[PDB]
Amino acid sequence: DRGVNTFSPEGRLFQVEYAIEAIKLGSTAIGIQTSEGVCLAVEKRITSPLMEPSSIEKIVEIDAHIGCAMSGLIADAKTLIDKARVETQNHWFTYNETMTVESVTQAVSNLALQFGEEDADPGAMSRPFGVALLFGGVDEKGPQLFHMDPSGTFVQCDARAIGSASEGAQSSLQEVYHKSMTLKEAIKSSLIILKQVMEEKLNATNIELATVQPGQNFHMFTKEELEEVIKDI
Amino acid sequence: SRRYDSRTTIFSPEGRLYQVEYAMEAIGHAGTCLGILANDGVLLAAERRNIHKLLDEVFFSEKIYKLNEDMACSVAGITSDANVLTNELRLIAQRYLLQYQEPIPCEQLVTALCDIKQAYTQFGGKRPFGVSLLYIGWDKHYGFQLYQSDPSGNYGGWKATCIGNNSAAAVSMLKQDYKEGEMTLKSALALAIKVLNKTMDVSKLSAEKVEIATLTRENGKTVIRVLKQKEVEQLIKKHEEEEAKAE
Amino acid sequence: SYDRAITVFSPDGHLFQVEYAQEAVKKGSTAVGVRGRDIVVLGVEKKSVAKLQDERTVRKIALDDNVCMAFAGLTADARIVINRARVECQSHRLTVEDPVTVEYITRYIASLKQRYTQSNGRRPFGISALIVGFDFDGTPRLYQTDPSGTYHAWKANAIGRGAKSVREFLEKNYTDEAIETDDLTIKLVIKALLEVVNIELAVMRRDQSLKILNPEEIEKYVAEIEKEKEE
Amino acid sequence: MEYLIGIQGPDYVLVASDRVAASNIVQMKDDHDKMFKMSEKILLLCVGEAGDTVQFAEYIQKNVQLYKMRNGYELSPTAAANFTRRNLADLRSRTPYHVNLLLAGYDEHEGPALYYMDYLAALAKAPFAAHGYGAFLTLSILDRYYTPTISRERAVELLRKCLEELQKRFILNLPTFSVRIIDKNGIHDLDNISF
Amino acid sequence: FRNQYDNDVTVWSPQGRIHQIEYAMEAVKQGSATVGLKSKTHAVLVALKRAQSELAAHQKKILHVDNHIGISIAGLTADARLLCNFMRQECLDSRFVFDRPLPVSRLVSLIGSKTQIPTQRYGRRPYGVGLLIAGYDDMGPHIFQTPSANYFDCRAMSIGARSQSARTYLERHMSEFMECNLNELVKHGLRALRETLPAEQDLTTKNVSIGIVGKDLEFTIYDDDDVSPFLEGLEER
Amino acid sequence: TGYDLSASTFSPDGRVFQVEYAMKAVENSSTAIGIRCKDGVVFGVEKLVLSKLYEEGSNKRLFNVDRHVGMAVAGLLADARSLADIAREEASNFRSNFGYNIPLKHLADRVAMYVHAYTLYSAVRPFGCSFMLGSYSVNDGAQLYMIDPSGVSYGYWGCAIGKARQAAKTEIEKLQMKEMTCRDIVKEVAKIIYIVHDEVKDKAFELELSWVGELTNGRHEIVPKDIREEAEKYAKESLK
Amino acid sequence: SRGSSAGFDRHITIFSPEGRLYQVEYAFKAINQGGLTSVAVRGKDAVIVTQKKVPDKLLDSSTVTHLFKITENIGCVMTGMTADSRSQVQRARYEAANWKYKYGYEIPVDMLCKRIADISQVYTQNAEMRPLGCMILIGIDEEQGPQVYKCDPAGYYGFKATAAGVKQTESTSFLEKKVKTVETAITCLSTVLSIDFKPSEIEVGVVTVENPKFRILTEAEIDAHLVALAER
Amino acid sequence: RGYSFSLTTFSPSGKLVQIEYALAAVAGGAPSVGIKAANGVVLATEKKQKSILYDERSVHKVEPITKHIGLVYSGMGPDYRVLVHRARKLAQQYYLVYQEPIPTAQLVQRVASVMQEYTQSGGVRPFGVSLLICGWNEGRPYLFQSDPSGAYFAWKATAMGKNYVNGKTFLEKRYNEDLELEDAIHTAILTLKESFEGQMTEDNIEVGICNEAGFRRLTPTEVKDYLAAI
């Protein structure tokens, strides 16, 4: 055995590479930045008809202006999304304004590589978070998309694919994208690429999608609102 | 430090905890100890492991431990682990009697000690305790009871059971003869030595090889006594008699 | 103290101790709960029956006045998790002056199973959980949690040994005609557990403060379904 | 100042409390309930310094309910009264609770039980007890007419004499009075005695 | 061997070396290269930006540390962000106590003190990052280089992958840098980073980042539109 | 071997191999010599500059650890800055408690115990650096102490540490250090540094020199520029 | 058995299948790796003497010493690894001044060597540190006169005549043959080594009933006893 | 600081193999014999001491704890002195709490727990001693024996160390209950004679007794007196 802080001869931490290997098993997420806002789409991947599909939640409210997608080991995104919500509410408490999305992604990506087994404030983390995230939101800079990975390396995006079917969906997102694309068209092409990569058959029961606008809040789509855009197929 | 770490608290390739199973195999060689729940009391029937030599017999029991006024327990496994846990059990029962000014119900003590034994099988990196404990006790809620505990932290209610050496064959004898709701103390003392006569392969039964203690209620007070040398002496010959009348 | 990392990443994205914790799930007793629209009926399997057993202490089925739950796997871990959930439920009753919802304590147990998959020197719990209860509005509920800490809601399910085949049975059989009444829900529960199995059962009706069977009734149900599965 | 009264009978306990919450010249609540349900057979009457009362009562209450959850049965009133006494006694600490308490309970095996407790957590079991400055005016009538074999109608009559003594002689305006009785059938709410 | 001496930082290999320290320098020898240099008046950083995917925008390789210091990254990014928050805290404590910003030469010795401590204690790893630190204080502009806890004072310095050609170019032209103005100074570093690229790729408005600090100019990151006058320029490759 | 992965483990013949492997790591690094003389101590270090991009003043191997005490190091230098800060804190605490400048014998035996404290435990590694301490005062004379990473400390007339230690020690032995002035000692020090220098391997180096003595009234100072440059000139013309 | 080993019982302080502690056995070899020998003996009025190895001639011989002053009345000679020797001298100085501060009188010799042995035992029990491979004590007791005590890395410890280091057993055998005051010590040291030393080669410390202070002799005083030997 | 994991771990047959190795470390130690007489207890042990240079009055193997409780051991010396310091500390905490000399069973029940902790704590090896603890209280003598496991027994006569099995057989032969204290010493020296291997003196054994008068080690003149007719 060896530590969680062991360098390979390539200069990579073994655990940091293996968490990126655990990225590639997750439900594939698609988020796209437009000028009218950001849309985010994740596949639910229903495994059984005995399951309630509504209780799976892979796109979350962070605040009134920020959405977030996820892929991989959603139990890690539990503590990540809860620390993100606490940071946004502390920014509202302290500064009486909305927290910008870049500082939110920086705060969350600090929790990545706050792990280790010797400093060890009592029972903190012993392994890297094997979840990669897409932060979509609006602030005084406008609609933005951010991307984060298990290395804690965060960056701005215009559209991005994370997860098991990330590879071809990233090239297809290279294909469709232009800066003058509207929000509804981005919903349309995001469901196009998700239906390209879903093994199951797409309807309003096996996906989630939400939008954030400058005008309106983060709005998770209901089943009929999903069905309305899904009629276009 | 990682070369020497034995990792007692990790899973197997099959989802097993090897130190807990090896503790159970250590219990499999321990002394045969059985207890039978009757109508008007509970007994314990054991194997004495102080198998005689120039030993002194200074205590009133070797393996029977009074835990409070209303309960007693037996042990089987390592002697030294058992001393630590039955030191802990008394602190639990007296913290309860401190806090509520009434004696503790019999199941709370067992689940507390199984919480403590469960904690060491998961974290801390220690070795787990290798002891089984049979639990007798009276309370005003359910009266006379019996339990059995293991190193994994399991417990169950029983009316007759057996731990230690040849324990499965002893419970095999115990299944066929137990009269549910009809057993007195005298028939249970006959029955326990009936099983102990056929589970003990070393030095066919003599005055010691056993501790027998009964838990009874008398004038609103709980009485736990270990039977003295004369009364065990009688119960055993005085019933090889009954084995002689069987033809 | 002891602060090694036990649960570490394998060469291909597999927390070994999480796989083995689900192995420890896979050899436990199989449990089912089936939701009707005004009742939720739980069914758990027995282990090693042992007719000398005092049945009172081996019950596998009240966290509060309104919520009970099913488990599978290592029994002491299950009793630990129940004793965590009960003190959290009564602290919730302390702070909000209302009894708990099932989602709050299910999310708490779902996070409790994950925090011990990432802490220093702690092995994962080896248990799954199916949780039942009744809300203030009368909506019946059944959820699932597993040793990774992922949680879903379900209409009826099974965890443990042979849970795949019992889930195959419940997928075909979960109809509105199967769960009209309380009695046919109980029937369906014993039908679903009788694929592999002798079982415990308890019933929870709306504001009725969970009542356990009474195996005399269970024997009538199992004979009534057993002669049907013989003919 | 708040008022308490409780009467322990042969197979019942009758307790009553004033229904007033005051703020320094004025009363701010005239339907104030000082009786908190501990469990099916036990009430704790709680008066004293404001804030300490409700926090202490609810902290005891969730531990009694938690014991019922862990064990499947209720605390005896002796055990819950000694538990409340222990928690109030642990006084010399940084968290003193200046609370005045009566506990009424019914046990299957011991019957009706009534416990008196001051802010020192001195625990005294009594056939009848009362708190407040109004206790000084009515423990004399309770010493006059109480016998151990009082049936519950004579108990409500003697309680009515005591509250009429509060109306005639006591200087604080205590016009409305809530009453409950505990026996083997659980808790029973009785009609409010008003003046 | 290879195998029982590469597993701990606290094991001397029998040649008198520590293999976990030398493996940490591979993390700086793989990263996207960056070039730093100074004049008598200015200090400038030139860095390649790694954008992960063409729709993903560009990784910040220059980080604000105060008004008067900016750093560059090559390697494990989150270790450099840890060290950025450290240097932010040190300059703020020096301003809060002494009411003058901390001199850069003392601050980089504090970083060398901080990164040294995990390189000796069991269960810890060396920081897998090398830095270029550009700052201005009383002693003029500075370019520093910090994994193995060493720190170097530099006239002009380039770290990262394939950086040897950029170091040769800076060895060729370091004799000019003291008397160049602000405009020529960044042009030399742009050519120095352009030495490191493959032959087909060019320096664009998106994949080159610039930080600049001077005698009266507070530190600023030069990005997409701000890089355009400094890009033009330019002597072609 | 299995017996050299830990400093807390003796080998079957009675050797502690992590310490004896750290003393191979000391003699990887460049030469530093120090010569004690009649009235003071002079230090001399071969300071390599690995690339001429590097400014002057980078990778100094002469540290001040008190205002009357200097220090010359060899080995993995990142550890040597840590031991310099330990010696600085130890001399500061002695001035604060006992009210006067720390005697060099006691300072060497505090820092030798701090160095030795890591050669016992599996939870740390032994320091990869040897170092010297020199001082002067009117009451104590001049003193020169040398510590190797095993923790062992002694007082020296002249010492050489680093990869060229023996050829330098035989050359320091050739000199009469006991009766010369320090301005006459810098020329030998500079002689021996250029004598033992490997010029075909690891080129492009610099000379670094400092003394403490009566001529600086006990204050530890660097050598001035013209004196150091004429010592370089004398040593280059002696080198041929 | 007699050469069995299971797992890490050669790498840490745990028991062999025979009941031996291997690292504590290996710690005695570190005393022989020092390459020295010391001799201590007591009379009715005690002395220690050890070699001085001075090879380099760059050494300041005022600072090379294996005779240490523990308190004013108790001195000692170390043998073995040098840094561990200075560590245990620091620890013995701290325990002697701690005894004097707690109990108001100068520490006994046997209560110093029992304390150093109870310190040195802990490293033969806890697995994370190594035992110190390095001590002979002398002082004037009150009801016993001169005392000689020897502690070892295993934690054992009282003597009339002893030796330590590489020539332990042979000088022990010589003193065993003879005993059935400084001159006995210097003849015992000169016999096993066959060097017939110079006054710059050995150092002697004396503690006496006339002077209870530990006293370290000058060079001419050792030369006078060497020349007193030289005429036999 | 310390490791936190055990070094005493369960073998597949259920044995704590470190304890069964420490018992072999006990079996190689110096032989020790204790006999409970009718009017008190005798403790006697072989001093494995030769190379005459050793000043025999500097170390004692029979070390008292209170005014009627003593110890003897077989196995590693410095672990025994660790247990003597801990046992005296526990007995004096008892005397602080209850203002009574500690019952001999209570010192064993505390010292056995202290020996138990090191078979389960982090990074420590088990002790390498088996103790014999004698005591006189309530007009009645006690003899106990503790193990490196932490288990403890009560004996009337026992032997430990080298050749302890034949020592137990030799104490099986000679023992009867009515034996007085001087006859118990006379049997104990004959028991230690069985594997002494050459010329016992007053300097190479150590005998302590406990009776109504208290615990004391016998002076070399008295043990030299008892070796007459032996």
Q: Is H78 in Cβ contact with G154 (below 8 Å)?
A: yes
Chains near E (3 or more Cβ pairs under 8 Å): A, F
Task: Return the structure tokens found at G85.
Answer: 């020797």
C175-198 as b/e: b if 16+ CB within 10 A: eeebbeeeebbbbbbbbbbbbeee
Q: What's G223's domain CATH number?
A: 3.60.20.10
Q: Is F10 in Cβ contact with G23 (below 8 Å)?
A: yes
Where do the domains of chain C lie, and which CATH numbers do they carry? Answer: 1-231 (3.60.20.10)
Q: How many CB atoms lie within 10 A of CB E2?
A: 8
Tell me how long chain D is: 195
Chain E hits for A6, Cβ within 8 Å: 6-7, 20, 125
CB contact G94 to B (< 8 Å): no
Tell me how long chain F is: 240
Interface of B with F in 1-40 (CB under 8 A): 1, 3
CB contact F59 to E (< 8 Å): yes
Sign of CA dihedral A37, A42, A43, A48: negative
User: What is the signed CA dihedral for H93, H98, H99, H104, rounded to 10 degrees?
Assistant: -70
Chain D residue closest to C91 (CA)?
Answer: D62
| Alpha carbons G146 and G43: distance in angstroms, whole number | 7
CB contact G142 to B (< 8 Å): no
Select the residue of A22, A25, A50 nearest C174 (Cβ to Cβ): A50
- Phi and psi dihedrals of A16, rounded to 5? -70, -35
Sign of CA dihedral G99, G105, G106, G109: negative
E72-87 as b/e: b if 16+ CB within 10 A: bbbbbbbbbbbbbebb
Chain B hits for G128, Cβ within 8 Å: 1
Q: How was this model experimentally determined?
A: cryo-EM
Peptide bond into D105 cis (omega under 30): no
Selection from D93, D85, D5, D81 nearest residue D39 by Cα: D81
Determine A/C contact with 3+ CB pairs under 8 A as the test.
yes
Cα distances from H15 to residues B60, D60, G3, H122, H148, in angstroms, run 29, 48, 22, 19, 14
| Alpha carbons E120 and F114: distance in angstroms, whole number | 14
Q: Which residue has the tokens 């001159």?
A: G183
Q: Considering only CB atoms, which residues of chain B are within 8 Å of chain H?
A: 1, 4-8, 18-19, 22-23, 25-29, 50, 53-59, 78-81, 83-84, 87, 124-127, 130
Where do the domains of chain A lie, and which CATH numbers do they carry? Answer: 1-233 (3.60.20.10)
Q: Is F82 in Cβ contact with E116 (below 8 Å)?
A: yes
| Alpha carbons D179 and D18: distance in angstroms, whole number | 9
Chain H hits for C3, Cβ within 8 Å: 4
Query: From start to end of chain E, where are the E strands?
Result: 34-38, 43-48, 62-64, 69-75, 129-137, 140-145, 152-154, 156-159, 208-213, 220-222
Residue G200: CA atoms inside 13 Å, Cβ hemisphere, count? 7
Chain E residue closest to A16 (CA)?
Answer: E76
Sign of CA dihedral B141, B146, B150, B156: negative
Cα F166 off chain centre by:
15
CB within 8 Å of D107: residues ≥ 6 apart: D41, D76, D77, D78, D113
Residue B109 DSSP symbol: H
- How many angstroms separate the CA of residue C50 from the nearest CA in chain A? 34
Disruptive mutation site among H1, H21, H147 for chain G (greatest number of G CBs within 10 Å): H21
Q: Is C123 exposed, middle or buried (0-12, 13-18, 19+ CB in 10 A)?
A: buried
Chain C residue closest to D65 (CA)?
Answer: C90
Residue B87: CA atoms inside 13 Å, Cβ hemisphere, count? 12
CB contact G11 to B (< 8 Å): yes
Q: Is H5 in Cβ contact with C3 (below 8 Å)?
A: no
Q: Is E7 in Cβ contact with A6 (below 8 Å)?
A: yes
Q: Which residue has the tokens 């490191």?
A: E196
Q: Is C149 in Cβ contact with A75 (below 8 Å)?
A: yes
Resolution limit, Å: 3.5
Disruptive mutation site among A117, A155, A158, A170 for chain E (greatest number of E CBs within 10 Å): A155
Superfamily of domain H1-230: Aminohydrolase, N-terminal nucleophile (Ntn) domain (3.60.20.10)
| Alpha carbons D183 and D181: distance in angstroms, whole number | 7
Q: How many CB atoms lie within 10 A of CB G134?
A: 25
| Alpha carbons G42 and A194: distance in angstroms, whole number | 94
What percent helix, strand, coil does chain C show, rounded to 5?
Answer: 40, 25, 40
CB contact C80 to B (< 8 Å): yes
| Alpha carbons G13 and F122: distance in angstroms, whole number | 13
Long-range (24+ apart) CB contacts under 8 A made by C193-196 are C193/C30, C193/C32, C193/C43, C193/C45, C193/C166, C194/C222, C194/C225, C194/C226, C194/C229, C195/C162, C195/C165, C195/C166, C195/C169, C196/C30, C196/C45, C196/C161, C196/C162, C196/C165, C196/C166
Tell me how long chain H is: 230
| Alpha carbons G88 and G106: distance in angstroms, whole number | 19
Chain G hits for B4, Cβ within 8 Å: 8, 11-12, 127
Q: Is A122 exposed, middle or buried (0-12, 13-18, 19+ CB in 10 A)?
A: exposed
Helices assigned H by DSSP within F55-178: 77-98, 104-116, 165-173
What does the longest C-alpha to C-alpha distance in chain E come to? 55
- DSSP H or E run through H107: helix H104-117
Domain range for G161 is 1-232
Where do the domains of chain E lie, and which CATH numbers do they carry? Answer: 1-237 (3.60.20.10)
Q: Is B245 exposed, middle or buried (0-12, 13-18, 19+ CB in 10 A)?
A: exposed
CB contact H4 to C (< 8 Å): yes
| Alpha carbons G27 and G88: distance in angstroms, whole number | 15
3-state secondary structure of B239: helix
Disruptive mutation site among B56, B63, B123 for chain H (greatest number of H CBs within 10 Å): B56
CB G171 within 8 A of CB G39: yes
Residue G108 DSSP symbol: P
Domain ranges of chain B: 18-245
Number of domains in chain G: 1
CB F157 within 8 A of CB F147: no
Q: Considering only CB atoms, which residues of chain B are within 8 Å of chain G?
A: 1, 3-4
Task: Return the structure tokens found at B72.
Answer: 């007693």
Cα A49 off chain centre by:
26
- How many angstroms separate the CA of residue B3 from the nearest CA in chain G? 9
| Alpha carbons D39 and D103: distance in angstroms, whole number | 12
Domain range for F54 is 1-240
What pairs with residue E129 in β-bridges? E75
Peptide bond into E185 cis (omega under 30): no
- For every residue of G40-54, DSSP letters joined together read EE-----EEEEE---
Cα distances from E106 to residues E101, E144, F65, F199, in angstroms, run 11, 12, 16, 33
CATH 3.30.420.40 fits B18-245, yes or no: no
Chain A hits for E75, Cβ within 8 Å: 11
CB within 8 Å of E174: residues ≥ 6 apart: E37, E155, E156, F52, F53
- How many angstroms separate the CA of residue F78 from the nearest CA in chain G? 23
What percent helix, strand, coil does chain B show, rounded to 5?
Answer: 35, 20, 40
CB within 8 Å of C8: residues ≥ 6 apart: A4, A15, A126, A127, C15, C16
CB contact C46 to B (< 8 Å): no
| Number of helices followed by number of strands (H, E) in chain G | 7, 9
Chains near B (3 or more Cβ pairs under 8 Å): A, C, D, F, G, H
Interface of D with B in 24-63 (CB under 8 A): none
Selection from A16, A65, A21 nearest residue A164 by Cα: A21
Q: Is B9 in Cβ contact with C123 (below 8 Å)?
A: yes
| Alpha carbons F188 and H189: distance in angstroms, whole number | 78
Domain ranges of chain H: 1-230
Instruction: Return the ∠ at Cα B46 (arms to B45 and B49), rounded to 5°.
Output: 165
CB contact G6 to B (< 8 Å): no
Selection from B62, C120, F59, H90 nearest residue A3 by Cα: C120
Selection from H107, G134, C125, H122 nearest residue A75 by Cα: C125
Select the residue of F12, F155, F169 nearest G26 (Cβ to Cβ): F12
CB within 8 Å of B104: residues ≥ 6 apart: B68, B70, B71, B92, B93, B96, B97, B139
- Phi and psi dihedrals of F124, rounded to 5? -140, 175
Selection from H206, H216, H221, H230 nearest residue H66 by Cα: H216
Chain B hits for D82, Cβ within 8 Å: 99-102
Q: Is C23 in Cβ contact with B14 (below 8 Å)?
A: yes
Q: Is F81 in Cβ contact with E109 (below 8 Å)?
A: yes
Chain H hits for G156, Cβ within 8 Å: 77-78
Chain A hits for B2, Cβ within 8 Å: 1-3
| Alpha carbons G97 and H152: distance in angstroms, whole number | 40
CB contact C59 to A (< 8 Å): no
Determine B/G contact with 3+ CB pairs under 8 A as the test.
yes
What pairs with residue C129 in β-bridges? C71, C145
CB within 8 Å of G98: residues ≥ 6 apart: none
- DSSP H or E run through B127: none
- How many angstroms separate the CA of residue B6 from the nearest CA in chain F? 17
Where do the domains of chain D lie, and which CATH numbers do they carry? Answer: 1-195 (3.60.20.10)
What does the longest C-alpha to C-alpha distance in chain A come to? 55
Q: What's F218's domain CATH number?
A: 3.60.20.10
